[PDB]
Amino acid sequence: AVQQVRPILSVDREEARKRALNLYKAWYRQIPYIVMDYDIPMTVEQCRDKLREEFVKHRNVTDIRVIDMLVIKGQMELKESVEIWKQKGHIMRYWKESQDPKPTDFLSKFIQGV
């Protein structure tokens, strides 16, 4: 079920990690600047914590190509935060603080509607 297809950037899973971890470097190194530049509530530790979870967001990615794109997205978002194109609203977006975590257990769902 294999296909002999073009690459994008990374030719092997290890190069993929090499690229993926490079991004993790830029983001870790950037966090303090954004805490200063963007006047938002978030603090360095929380921003670091979210960065960890947000990589964990997709741990079981497998395809070399898919993981390459995820890194391509990150390098973009890095630059948009590195330079201050984004806005305090845009950067906080990662927390989703407007909506309360909706009910999850069956009764709370049942008693609160579909």
Partner: protein
């Protein structure tokens, strides 16, 4: 729904007064505070300074009003560029997501008493792009709108009619007279 009075009813009725409050004030403090409100409203009513946000398509009418056919500075309206010196904001055109935080920021950087006119359908309720992934459905969801000028765009007459309606709202606002009760 009500309707205008008929010729003979008008004949019976007296002058409609000038200050919308009327001249029924009881005591000296009441009567005095009525006049000071009238003066304040007169100042804020006669001189009103739009900010000229004017994103799009609607903006062209926002310029035609400045044009010499339906002259607007005739009424005491001037386009100050700087929001710190602008008293009113005529939000006109569509409000995309990229713009939403910008409009919010511009609005509250302006000092009050600040009134917003939502010109055009695109600002009123998102207009023709209402079911779009990128547009703020209306501008009521970013800022407190004061006057709605329907149209796509509103004919210039319609826009400055709305301006006069804002002047009427600025005329009847009760701040000193009713602080006295507060």
């Amino acid at each position: 729904q009500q309707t205008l009075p008929v010729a003979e009813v008008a004949q019976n009725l007296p002058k409609k007064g000038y200050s919308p409050f009327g001249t029924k004030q009881s005591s000296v403090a009441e009567w005095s505070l009525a006049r000071l409100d009238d003066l304040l409203n007169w100042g804020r009513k006669g001189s009103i300074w739009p900010l000229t946000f004017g994103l799009a398509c609607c903006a062209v009418e926002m310029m035609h009003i400045a044009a010499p056919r339906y002259d607007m500075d005739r009424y005491g309206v001037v386009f100050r560029a700087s929001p710190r010196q602008a008293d009113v904001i005529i939000v006109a055109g569509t409000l995309t997501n990229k713009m939403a935080p910008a409009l919010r920021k511009v609005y509250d950087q302006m000092p009050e008493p600040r009134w917003v006119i939502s010109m055009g359908s695109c600002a009123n309720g998102g207009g023709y792009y209402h079911y779009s992934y990128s547009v703020v459905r209306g501008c009521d969801r970013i800022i407190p709108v004061d006057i709605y000028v329907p149209g796509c765009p509103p004919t210039a007459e319609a826009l400055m009619y709305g301006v006069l309606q804002l002047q009427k709202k600025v005329k009847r606002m009760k701040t000193l007279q009713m602080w006295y009760r507060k």
